[PDB]
Symmetry: D2
């Protein structure tokens, strides 16, 4: 068997927007992402799927049954998001805080108790009370709670993504506006102040790199505001860095619990040995630039004491690799591997690809954990790992293989404190809608019933034993190719 | 949930030759099938895989661990074969019995206690003692035992399949020789006399239709003796009919426990409504001819009182359908469906096909059960159902779907007493060797370790609950096609 | 054999931007499309392929060899475009014309001889002289010349597509600016005045529906300006309508030769009989709205005498169908058929799909010809038909099948005057770059050599015989599926 | 261009049994192969396709139209077989010849003029006259005629393949009987005596290695007599060796024209460098053993002066490779490459596979030509090369690529005198029936009409120019994979 420490957390991760809606009274129309996915032009263009979150799995109303399944599966942790748009559907700009802003730089934001009380007057009571209700129930099952403050949607009062798509940059502009940083510090302080007693650890945000990169560079992804603007991507990145740091400080002024960040990762692997330097450039550009900012204070060639040391733990999201080849002194991501594969194809390495076109590459999780550990030596939590797999064809192998790699990291001395699968149940996969199914549990979106895929039973074995048991270790292997789609050659 | 009666048996089936060998001291070289699969000409022709049973899963030595897994899975029954070649590696012809033989017809075989004692003197002691040991352990787990007397291999002294392949029909000729019928009655009496205290129910033989049909007609299958001879097929069929009847009588002279037969089935479905009569002809020719003989005494246009009423229960093996189309007043099996599909392809009905090229068609199990019930109203046991599936891609759906159909049969009044999956573990699939993997448990043929596929955990849910539980009912559905091989169009 | 009239034209069509560049001295950087495909953000987003036209097949320099191949193939006609950006790389706004503009409506544009002389002073001499040189050579081979004035790129002084993408709608805005209509009338008059002696028939423009629809609605296509704006699509459509009418009048003031238009078509086929009305709505919205404007003067619910009767012939481009299903009182295009298929897949109708994901549907060409004929009874020319097919797998069948359908139309009384394949040679396929290969001739983009695919030899048979000969009629059939990619199911 | 010598022959090869029947009056029921393919047991087993030759392409009646197409294609040679079963449907045993037989060895057979006259009295006049008629017409088109005496079927009086399949080895036993050698010498002498004036070169037999190997070893191929017997394979091989030598001598006693043999070849390529010796063993066992016998007189370790020097030219048939890996001091053919691939799959080398599962490997034709040349330095004729390809997907590339390799051999000094494609038209592919379509011309088996595939037009280019012209040289390349079936991985 492959045995984990007694205190190692097995659980799941979940986003508010992706999972909450679907039950009566849950609809939240007040976010940029809601507007974005309902926008007729976006639907007609195929930027978004045409599926809508309000037809989703209904965690808002049915949380007890999600928690029942998690408890039955032996899970001991959950990272779940709260939605800013639910808690502050109306603007909080008028709440005075003590901020130092020098042009583009937000160096401090102090949120007084008076400000928290004013925020409480503005907050949506049903929302914050309901979050307490859900997370209280979660805790009642023996499940430790990691609260993630931000998982992409913004209140519409902060971001009109359609106006921005259209190039009206004077409209509310989300992460292009330093004001969003200050408002986020306010929000973060408020939520900690309200909910801290339920929380084990905090994450300020999830995959900010996806927000800046898909929002403003990889616009065919269909993410808001879909305004093709590399300078905007950089501005958003910096504001997300600053938002993280200012949220960290705001939360720390309320609680001393660990405050971290969750980030989207790939293992950047060189196509050939000659591409090793190119792979290193890719790691820096796509990963270290953000973490060097929030850990070491290093941003854009300058060091900021207000950014340094603003991280207690790192949430590693990992799905697959990106293969890199040198292109002059730059680099390029090689199609056909990693994230860039044919849906339900096979890479040139002989690795099957998911329903999303993501290559089976569990080794990359070890590499990414090791690399973050060696660089910063901050505690790591695998905050997402999973697969879009409607048939549960690859998922059993994917699960076991990736868990094994976490164990390997641990054996080599990486302080990884848990593994959170994405996700407990199927949910609304952003611009792709419902057809990308990442659950251990299948969701019937008509009935809202949860259904156990066989992988869920495998995960129960792991979580209850805190081990890859002898019975299931064989799943630490690549899915046999013959029975799977071959893709195209 | 889909709930079964309290006394309904969930278990597995297993053959001696397919599963026993692989551990030191287990090798049995004294069968036609052993000779057949080691024959250099057959190997070179690709008639047989070149894999050998002596490299198999090792039930002979490792039975306790098979039983441990079955007990852990909640299984309550097993149908397991004994090998005639192990028990009587030397000829028993000289043991006198009271038989009435009129040309091709064996009308009676009475095996006296003197004959049983003489047989006991000739029997391989290690073999019979070891069978008692294995089956005693099986019973000690709360597993009811259905003993199947014959599952294809014959002692070499009864059948030299290479000599027969070569057309030397004066060599020992297996089921072409009426003497084999008499020897089988002797064998059957002996085994019942020795082992009855361990047995719940008996089956005389397994899939005799495969023996006659693959042996002498469908010779590309690579089954012994591979002597293309339709008249021989008919002779073998009749002798298997007579062997069943004479074994039934011999066993009944020793024990009053139920004695049945296990047979290979397909649902014969008409391609179009115009093919309904053709499908009925196919059912008669391939199924009813045998059962009308051993139930109703009707064989070849004549009725035999020595054949009538020689059946207490029917073991239904079922894997897939055969699609039938009329061809004049005859019929033909349509390629691309049923047993005749592309390995890991998809039929024109949109049903995925297994590693063996067998179509996903759970509805056929209901139909076959219903049809046998309506015709004979004898108790039915699903004695085999499973899938060659190295990835466990289709098996979870296959399992649940077929179990559901058994429940449907029950609800409609069919007396089906249990469901036995083929198989607990991977084993030697005849001419195909080890590459066709039917287990709930994967076998590592190097280490002989058993490994739980996710389907095994699904089956544990079913067996322990005696139900398709709410958590797994969704698997009563067709595997999603997109992720699977499409085959060729 | 399937025999065509003696005067029926077999030829090819070709665009300037797609085919001209690739030889030294040919580069034309002064178009919106050039800027668009070189834009780093567009490249990084995958909106455009990253391939560049200046690496293309080099018709500008190598035209004689294209013409040699066409002449060897027996071709008797070519529709070839001229590029406005080459002829007027600097703005022509200052040239005074007599135009009546009432808000959004351009009711007349009269281009005097003084204006033509002023335009001649501004025109790029090398460009216009080189067009005369190329088209003179074309004519010297016995090839009749259909001149198409516009095939998507605009001079950069008329359209900064990057500024528009960014939402700076005060930048030069192409077909969003009524001034572009007037400038197009000037251009059209100039080219006719210069080149008329070489021209058999004129087309004002090619596939204006692609320009408005891909430019402003189907933005994932990666066409300029890629500004998602349905209102803009409508504005561009109207301006293209007006541009056509004003160009028609301007050309007719110089020459009485036939002036037509070339348009992108699909056969809109109903998924079920219940979708017939929905298919009719799709035809109107996607096809008749434009032609009713330029034939009948009907636009937006009002009739314009300045639009009525501005068409002498219709160029039918046709590649595949679109399957339509009713959606309430609207309709939707069904994925998996027509233009919306898996590249190198197979539709649910069993029709193979091209390298572009376009379904094999030759019957639609008959339907589209018949429908245009029945509605307007204007002479028809099949101005494009072809397939992206790097292996020449489907093309031989595609060619013969579609030619057959043209013959069927003719037999039923449609006045179709010729068939022009897209294309003689591989070329730059817009946002897809060079990897979509539509040639009868393969282009080696390194050497610029032309290579005859087997389909080219088939087309020689057709063109030289003016018939589908008995030897090749069998190619009027669907490509056999077994050897082709199956796609995914 | 790739230019061939002025006298280099481009043509086709054709078998009597495969192509003759299909027109009224052509049926020849008097051969082992006819009996074999009509045998109900063989049909039911799937040994044979169930298709029958009497439904074939009808060369017997329609030869003029085959010749018309060949002449239109510029072909200058044909190798066509005559059928012994047609010419001597009744036994010739009684015709006395002067033979020296020492047990298994036929050392001489002298056929006197008296014997030839007696044979003429026994010969089927219609048959021999019709062969003269067909071959006279062939010659009248400028087509040189290579007569092949034997192409597998035997008269039924010489071989009852069903009796042999059944193991009745006292029945007429074909190449297991030395008498067949003597009868073949008689036949060969007779045909030369009758037809010599029409013949340029003779071949005694075609692919005798297929006859012995498929007949008696690779019995799943469904070739007669399908009697699995390695000793019989060896006996048949020796008798075919002796038949060749005795036919050579008999024909040479009548004519001094060149007498050769046609043989089935593969390039035996080592999987890894470590397998080079194994590949050499495979070449000897499968190729050199036969040629060392008929060239060098070396057979079975002894040298026979009556076998030495009995070859004037070698007909190289070539379709694909066989990949070889060492297995101890022996070797094995690696599945997935060469002849052993998935139909319409792709090998691990990235080479597409035909409808027969044969890998695209043109390089092997060079290798095989070079190897035969270096060993024996006898003139070579590529007597077959082609592909089963119903869509003409791979054939254009296959044709050009293999012709190129012949040119390469020539450039390196191999005396290759021509290239004969298999085949002009589709025909009856033995146990596979009509579904394997090797023609440059497609045959409609209902109408018997011939249809030109595009490859036929490519071959016309080659044959008329005696060159791979600049226009078609690009087809010397591997078919692009994306559009083709990927097979399974
Ligand atoms: Na699975
Ligand atoms: Na082709």
């Amino acid at each position: 068997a492959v045995t984990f420490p007694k205190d190692f957390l097995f659980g799941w991760s979940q986003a508010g927007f992706q999972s909450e809606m679907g039950t009566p009274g849950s609809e939240d129309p007040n976010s940029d992402w809601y507007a974005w996915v309902h926008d007729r032009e976006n639907i007609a263009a195929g930027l978004v799927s045409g599926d809508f979150p309000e037809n989703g799995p209904g965690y808002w109303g049915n949380y007890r049954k999600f928690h029942d399944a998690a408890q039955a599966m032996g899970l001991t942790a959950a990272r779940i998001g709260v939605e800013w748009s639910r808690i502050f559907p109306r603007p909080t700009f008028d709440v005075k805080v003590d901020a130092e802003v020098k042009g583009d730089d937000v160096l401090s934001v102090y949120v007084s108790e008076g400000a928290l009380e004013q925020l409480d007057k503005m907050a949506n009571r049903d929302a914050i009370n309901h979050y307490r209700e859900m997370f209280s129930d979660l805790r009642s099952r023996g499940i430790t709670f990691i609260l993630n403050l931000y998982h992409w949607p913004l209140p519409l009062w902060l971001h009109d993504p359609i106006a921005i798509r259209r190039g009206n940059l004077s409209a509310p502009s989300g992460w292009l506006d330093v004001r969003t940083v200050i408002e986020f510090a306010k929000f973060s302080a408020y939520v900690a102040w309200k909910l801290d007693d339920l929380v084990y650890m905090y994450s300020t945000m999830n995959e900010p790199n996806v927000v800046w990169g898909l929002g403003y560079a990889a616009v065919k992804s269909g993410f808001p505001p879909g305004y093709l603007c590399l300078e905007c991507a950089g501005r958003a990145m910096k504001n997300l860095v600053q938002a993280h740091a200012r949220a960290y400080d705001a939360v720390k002024a309320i609680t001393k619990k660990p405050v971290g960040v969750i980030y989207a990762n790939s293992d950047f692997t060189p196509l050939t040995d000659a591409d090793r330097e190119a792979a290193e450039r890719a790691k820096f550009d796509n990963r270290w630039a953000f973490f060097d900012a929030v850990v070491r204070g290093q941003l854009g060639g300058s060091t900021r004491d207000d950014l340094k040391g603003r991280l207690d733990w790192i949430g590693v999201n990992y799905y697959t690799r990106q293969v890199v080849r040198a292109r002059g002194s730059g680099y390029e991501i090689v199609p056909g591997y990693g994230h860039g594969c044919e849906p339900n194809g096979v890479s040139p390495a002989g690795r099957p690809c998911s329903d999303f076109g993501w290559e089976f590459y569990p080794e990359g999780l070890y590499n990414v954990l090791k690399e973050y550990w060696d660089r910063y030596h901050l505690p790591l939590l695998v905050t997402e790992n999973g697969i879009a797999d409607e048939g549960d064809y690859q998922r059993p192998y994917y699960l076991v293989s990736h868990v094994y790699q976490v164990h390997r990291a641990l054996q080599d001395g990486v302080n990884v404190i848990g593994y959170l699968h994405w996700s407990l149940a199927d949910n609304y996969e952003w611009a792709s809608g419902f057809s990308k199914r990442f659950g251990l549990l299948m969701v019937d979106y008509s009935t809202k019933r949860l259904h156990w895929r066989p992988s869920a039973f495998i995960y129960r074995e792991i979580a209850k034993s805190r081990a890859i048991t002898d019975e299931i270790e064989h799943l630490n292997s690549v899915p046999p190719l013959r029975g799977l789609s071959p893709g195209h050659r």
